[PDB]
């Protein structure tokens, strides 16, 4: 049963949430290969675990930049949550640790590359292709929300394709365990729900709105609200008018009018029937959820894998020396990491 699985899932999560794993590896157990991606206060690198020969992806966050951009609390959220969760489509945290300069999170290496890269290159995905990914995001948000977690940073930039062509969700930087409502103005301009922009309080429904932006971008090739300047993007999100490409199917557009819904009383995911309003939507009719969860379904796209440690699915980034200061920076701020 789903309730049964989730109840067992919750009991597993809670024991880890209350008793977080900490300091389970050290920088020197890993050989650094290549920068796979960057962010405002850090970067992610392909690494190899010396003792087993396994490959992993290591996220390195600069503590001082986290503080300058006031992201201390957000970062503690990310690790605490990530180590407690366990789902087929979540990038697994294999180990975490910190040093004088940085925080470290060592995740499974997902060799297929970012959805973003494939999306911009190909232009757009077919609907059955976009659906296969969307279904996985749907199950993942069901899992996540059942734990009282809000995700808040969905975008193609934050989704990876695995070796059998299934999706893996990454970046828990804005994720938060919250039962009530919250106020932080955060996320990516194109993906912000209107309630975030207008400084109202908000909840898990912002994730379902973001899913709507994602599905639209995957199927259209561009986002529903864009302009040269964020101020102008907000003016567009807030006005709420949305236009769809002519090739979007009816089921798709309907699904999106409901996810991209400014009225919180009407947004899909946020109603009485919860996520089932989405799983049972016509656009997903051909989707077998159990088979999807069991990974028994054939993926629409199997990435080219030219061997272990291959990185040809990621862009090249300027390599910077990973410098670790001789002084502890911001020790008190990150004590529990």
């Amino acid at each position: 049963s789903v309730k049964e699985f989730l109840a067992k899932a919750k009991e597993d999560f809670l024991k880890k949430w209350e008793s977080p794993a900490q300091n389970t590896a050290h920088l020197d157990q890993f050989e650094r290969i290549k920068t796979l991606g960057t962010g405002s206060f850090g970067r992610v690198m392909l690494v190899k675990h010396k003792e087993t020969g396994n490959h992993y992806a290591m996220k390195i966050l600069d503590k001082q930049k986290v503080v300058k951009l006031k992201q201390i609390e957000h970062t503690l959220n990310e690790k605490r949550i990530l180590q407690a969760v366990n789902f087929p489509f979540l990038v697994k945290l294999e180990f975490s640790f910190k040093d004088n300069s940085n925080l470290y999170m060592v995740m499974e290496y997902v060799p297929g590359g970012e959805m973003f890269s494939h999306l911009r290159r190909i232009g757009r995905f077919s609907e059955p292709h976009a659906r296969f990914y969307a279904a996985q995001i749907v199950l993942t948000f069901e899992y996540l929300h059942s734990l009282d977690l809000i995700y808040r940073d969905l975008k193609p930039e934050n989704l990876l394709i695995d070796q059998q062509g299934y999706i893996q969700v990454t970046d828990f930087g804005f994720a938060k365990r919250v039962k009530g409502r919250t106020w932080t103005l955060c996320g990516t301009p194109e993906y912000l729900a209107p309630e975030i922009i207008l400084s109202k309080g908000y909840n898990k429904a912002v994730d379902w709105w973001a899913l709507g932006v994602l599905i639209y971008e995957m199927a259209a090739g561009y986002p529903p609200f864009f302009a040269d300047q964020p101020i102008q993007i907000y003016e567009k999100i807030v006005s709420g008018k949305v236009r769809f490409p002519s090739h979007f199917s009816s089921d798709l557009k309907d699904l999106l009018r409901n996810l991209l819904q400014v009225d919180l009383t009407k947004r899909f995911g946020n109603l009485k029937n919860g996520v089932n309003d989405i799983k049972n939507h016509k656009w997903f009719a051909t989707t077998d959820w159990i088979a999807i969860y069991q990974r028994k379904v054939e993926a629409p796209f199997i990435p080219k894998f030219k061997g272990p440690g291959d990185t040809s699915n990621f862009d090249d980034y300027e390599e910077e020396e990973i410098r670790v200061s001789i002084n502890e920076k911001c020790g008190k701020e990150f004590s529990e990491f």
Binding site: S40, F116, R120, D153, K155, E157, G173, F174, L185, C186, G187, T188, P189, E190, G221, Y222, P223, F226, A227, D228, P230, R243, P245
Partner: peptide, 18 residues
């Protein structure tokens, strides 16, 4: 076309969080 407007816009690269 909207695709042409997007592609010619300054926001087709990776977008940063605010």
């Amino acid at each position: 076309t909207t695709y042409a407007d997007f592609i010619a816009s300054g926001r087709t690269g990776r977008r940063n969080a605010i």
